[PDB]
């Protein structure tokens, strides 16, 4: 339900159509394998926490504030905050040798590519729409929605 509300707000944030930005489409190489099968969801908690934190970081920059509607952005942060709380509360209430640190680094590298893309494209409306659509996809995949 919370994941559906996050996607609802991110969909409402959309300003232009991706059809007008077909030449700016880009493969960000989302590390899908780091979120495993739907059966190992307990082990993917720290990875999902990093994913939500990185989405929050990406959308709370000065450039994001300029590109998206403030009212929708605030509701979006509220929903991301709620998801982080649920994950933290569960951690407070692990025995993996890596603690999925390799998985967290792969998620960070993915957001680094998004950041580099936006900078290279000079934060154009099309670049932001490509990133917004990419986050709609990767967030649905990470939350097994």
């Amino acid at each position, epitope marked *: 339900l919370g994941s559906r509300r996050t996607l609802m707000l991110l969909a409402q944030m959309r300003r232009i159509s991706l059809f007008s930005c077909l030449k700016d489409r*880009h*493969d960000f*190489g989302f590390p899908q394998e780091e979120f495993g099968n739907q059966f190992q969801k307990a082990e993917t908690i720290p990875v999902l926490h990093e994913m939500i934190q990185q989405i929050f970081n990406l959308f709370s920059t000065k450039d994001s504030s300029a590109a998206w509607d403030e009212t929708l952005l605030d509701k979006f942060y509220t929903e991301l905050y709620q998801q982080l709380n649920d994950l933290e509360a569960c951690v407070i209430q692990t025995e993996t040798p*890596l603690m999925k640190e*390799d998985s967290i*680094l*792969a998620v960070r*590298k993915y957001f680094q*590519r998004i950041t580099l893309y936006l900078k*290279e494209k000079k934060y154009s409306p099309c670049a932001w729409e490509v990133v917004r659509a990419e986050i709609m996809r990767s967030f649905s995949l990470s939350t097994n929605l």
Partner: single-chain antibody
Amino acid sequence: VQLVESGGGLVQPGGSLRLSCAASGFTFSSHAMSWVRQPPGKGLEWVSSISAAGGSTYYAASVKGRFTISRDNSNKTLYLQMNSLRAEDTAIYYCAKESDRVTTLDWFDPWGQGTLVTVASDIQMTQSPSSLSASVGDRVTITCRASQSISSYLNWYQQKPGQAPKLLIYAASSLQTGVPSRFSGSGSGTDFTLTISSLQPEDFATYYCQQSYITPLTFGGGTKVEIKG
């Protein structure tokens, strides 16, 4: 730093084989490892990568579902289980150490001596020219073009006949330790260039570019630098 491959041999189509790569001289458990293959008379092809602690694995589309990469950090050994082998799998298989704990945005260094096994990506890497003739003292320029922006995540390798590849430049322009100053790399986004300011007799080799932006990691077709008549 040494990497020793073993387990290569002649296998029947449909059969299976397990390759090994024994590592020494470095902290094996802190680096991701990859398998790169080279069919006879062809270019380099990334096969698979495994993270430092063995939890994350990546495969080329051509081997996904048939090959399995694994590692033993206690014995410092990397493995490649090859099942449902095809004639297409005939190649020299090299293991290579990656500079980070996880793949992408990195490079391969060093590489093993390789083991002989005798039985697509959306980022295309185009090298130009396919071959060039040059004299000792000439300025040589090799270009590499990516189908999409790869930022500065492009590496250059030198491969002499009958030898394993060697890293020359990483992250588009960073010169590898020990590589002479006559080699230089430049570019960002989609267009990249390797320049040898004054060609020496030891530089006649095949050069390859490689994107490390996203998986699958891909190599260019190669550029043979040959003598001039």
